[PDB]
Design a protein around this nucleic acid. Structure first.
Ligand SMILES: *OCCCCCCNc1c(NCCOCCO[C@H]2O[C@H](CO)[C@@H](O)[C@H](O)[C@@H]2O)c(=O)c1=O
Ligand SMILES: *OCCCCCCNc1c(NCCOCCO[C@H]2O[C@H](CO)[C@@H](O)[C@H](O)[C@@H]2O)c(=O)c1=O
Ligand SMILES: *OCCCCCCNc1c(NCCOCCO[C@H]2O[C@H](CO)[C@@H](O)[C@H](O)[C@@H]2O)c(=O)c1=O
Ligand SMILES: *OCCCCCCNc1c(NCCOCCO[C@H]2O[C@H](CO)[C@@H](O)[C@H](O)[C@@H]2O)c(=O)c1=O
Ligand SMILES: [Ca+2]
Ligand SMILES: [Ca+2]
Ligand SMILES: [Ca+2]
Ligand SMILES: [Ca+2]
Ligand SMILES: [Mn+2]
Ligand SMILES: [Mn+2]
Ligand SMILES: [Mn+2]
Ligand SMILES: [Mn+2]
Lengths: 231, 232, 232, 231
DNA sequence: AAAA
DNA sequence: TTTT
DNA sequence: AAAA
DNA sequence: TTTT
């Protein structure tokens, strides 16, 4: 299948599949059962911020998710992405809903990759009606107040259940080389998760994948648009 | 047909199509007949450097080509690329040979594009791998040979072949202008090594912005530099 | 005296010194009498944005000032800063009030300078701390008030004071031009909030490049914008 | 005294002060006795490259020193620079010689700092005769083939013993804030260490210090222009 | 995350 | 460097 | 880093 | 908004 490494902003605890009993951030390595998690105090309708970092030296994938005027959440997992991912990858944001639902609004996404030096950088602070350096998969859309809406939102602004959508940057990234001195990537995105319901689901993920990655069929809900099963 | 705006490093004067009677740098807008040129003192087998710049304010496309410890060459043309290009483009390097030949070696290529309605794209190649998947290679272009980009065919001994044409396009489309936008800018830098046995080299290198789906137009070896289907 | 090149956001028309009879943006070169101006539709209490650009190729200094969902203003002047400025400079924001007054609030300031003989300097302020040690604060300028830079004096209730002048210079000198150099460029962006009770605001904000040792010239409140010792 | 955190490229083993019996790279925290070291195969007269990285998340200071076509060296030490350094600092390169000598030539120096976002970046690939965004201390000089020569080199190109010199970037850097989400810095420099003698000494360091840092008197040789004593 |  |  |  |  697809090979996936993601940082999940999981809003809906699924204990059936190893999620803690609380909204959490996790590092996922080729499984939705996160290799490490941390408690995350998600804030309904507040604009939040995610930072994902990694290098070839420390080989440590870390993330930090923040809101204005509140303690942030942070998770870290030592993994050699030489041993998980192919040298060439695409990077993306994925989001899903199931029985329960939420807006998965992205307001900004930036990415920097360095490899010795070769460099790639992009920054989206607005998203146009037809954003041709993005590959939109499933329910993802652009042009709605200059935002990226990963999951379906009706004309009345109401979020839909059983939705899944991703956004991949068009150009493949060189993420690791055998004969390389230093490699690093940084990712930042701002998100707005809103539910009128007292159960928000299912969350957002930054993800690196094989270039040809697709939404695995039925990967709505707990699977967050990343995984075909919950192993 | 393709819509093309290029900065040509033209090494071979083609008088049949308006090229001056000397190696020149020029701005080409939907034609190989440059809108403006300048004398260029090309140095056979010396590593040279090109800088291309533009913004939505001055709407002036300029370029500067340099060698170590020698006077540079410069050309400038006022053009609104809002009126010339589609909003969405790919950026590339093209090179060709014909009857006469030269190595069209690229050692480095960087590109920065910024657009405030800030959105930004930046890439920098200082080495090129055997399989460079964020480049679309067209015709004879190849990567992996001493970490370089070889736009036109080169034998095992580095000896250049005639009647060759190749381009390299960055994979991701670029937002180069928007109607509802305050400031847009791009800069491009690349280093090149043009080498010929004999003091008769051809045909040159170009930085080019095109429609995303741009391909090497049929027969566009030699004078046409991998950009133009005819010489209008 | 100080050697000054500025882009003025002049809110108060001073006819005694050649200002047009409207709020304007202008290029000032060693004089408060702008070398060129343009009408500027200032918006009282709206967060606005300024972009200043220049390169050694076009040798054209341009600026663009914008508000949300409204036509921008633009001004451009051809000047060789090789002939005007010293090689080594400091960059700054200046603001002043006189008889009439306004908040001169800066919310963000970024600067990029590149010079190939590539040498590069980049800074970006999106928040400003209580003690910002990579800024040299001159006169009434202060930091820490809601993470902003307040160039001129503002009461506890945000009410602006008259007869105020303040500047903020980046601490490190910038290499803005070299004799033996191929390409040099700088860009500057800052966001500002100009607010007055009453439709009579004064006196405005400027991005400025100066001799490293530049100080607020004596008496340079009001029309002189913290830049000029007299109005020549 | 001055507060110093450095990555030392130590070419001369001083066993009297805890250096291993081989040329090494080390992390120094307010002492020349490195908190951690690693074997370094220094190459006489070859242009080498150093990378220093750190973030507020992993709070891990790492470095990697490389030459063309040879295995690199890398060292890492977990330290919270909130607890070592002041919020405001200057960054610099220091080099020294003693009884034994070497050219301490710097050909390039770049630095990036990010703090949430506020950012500082500089890159020197050439150094002019009068480089006014550098504070040169002791024997450091610029203009000699566009290089930075940290220690004294005679008119005949011969390196001098008992030399010490540093180069600090002019503008102070915000390296950590109490109420901050993410902070990172990256540093790259290329160096050319050459000795006609069979004993090269004493090495090069990237260093962060109090803004007002000075060459401690007699910090030639083993002390590398950083430390007043060898505790 | 709160009630059965 | 060939062709008018 | 090599010899005493 | 005052002064010619
Ligand atoms: O502090 C945490 C508050 C979250 C609400 C507490 C849980 N409430 C709850 C559960 N728990 C079992 C979860 O599995 C059933 C839901 O499965 C479907 O819905 C989710 C959400 O969209 C999705 O991940 C699945 O794939 C599937 O579509 C209940 O049954 C209940 O109520
Ligand atoms: O013995 C000294 C040789 C020096 C070369 C002289 C070049 N001739 C020349 C021209 N105009 C005629 C050029 O046409 C050449 C034929 O064109 C073919 O070759 C070129 C080079 O690859 C290519 O551009 C064409 O498309 C075609 O393949 C001058 O003005 C001048 O000098
Ligand atoms: O009741 C409606 C009031 C509207 C204000 C009218 C402004 N007057 C005016 C001028 N020219 C005269 C301006 O001189 C004002 C005195 O100058 C002092 O105040 C200003 C503002 O701080 C400052 O620039 C000076 O340096 C000095 O402090 C027009 O053309 C126009 O309109
Ligand atoms: O594989 C490693 C090869 C390096 C040479 C082997 C050591 N040779 C050596 C020593 N060892 C004792 C070192 O302390 C004496 C030198 O001290 C003076 O010189 C150094 C170098 O410039 C400096 O760090 C000190 O501060 C002082 O100036 C010898 O005595 C000998 O020979
Ligand atoms: Ca879940
Ligand atoms: Ca030609
Ligand atoms: Ca005025
Ligand atoms: Ca030592
Ligand atoms: Mn989970
Ligand atoms: Mn031509
Ligand atoms: Mn004015
Ligand atoms: Mn040591």
């Amino acid at each position: 299948a697809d090979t996936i490494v993601a940082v999940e902003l999981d809003t809906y605890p699924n204990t059936d599949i190893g999620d803690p009993s609380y909204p959490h951030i996790g590092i996922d390595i080729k499984s939705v059962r996160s290799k490490k998690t941390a408690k995350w105090n998600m804030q309904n309708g507040k604009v939040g911020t995610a930072h994902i970092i990694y290098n070839s030296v420390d080989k440590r994938l870390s993330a930090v998710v923040s809101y204005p005027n509140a303690d942030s959440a942070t998770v870290s997992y030592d993994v050699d992405l030489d041993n998980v991912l192919p040298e060439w990858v695409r990077v993306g944001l994925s989001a899903s809903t199931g029985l329960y639902k939420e807006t998965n609004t992205i307001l900004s996404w930036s990415f920097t990759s360095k490899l010795k030096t070769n460099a790639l950088h992009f920054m989206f602070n607005q998203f146009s009606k037809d954003q041709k350096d993005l590959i939109l998969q499933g329910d993802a859309t652009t042009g709605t107040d200059g935002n990226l809406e990963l999951t379906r939102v009706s004309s009345n602004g109401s979020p839909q259940g059983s939705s899944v959508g991703r956004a991949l940057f068009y150009a493949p990234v060189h993420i690791w080389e055998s004969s390389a001195v230093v490699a690093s990537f940084e990712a930042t995105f701002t998100f707005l998760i809103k539910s009128p319901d007292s159960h928000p689901a299912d969350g957002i993920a930054f993800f690196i994948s094989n270039i040809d990655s697709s939404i695995p069929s039925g990967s709505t809900g707990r699977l967050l648009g990343l995984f075909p099963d919950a192993n």
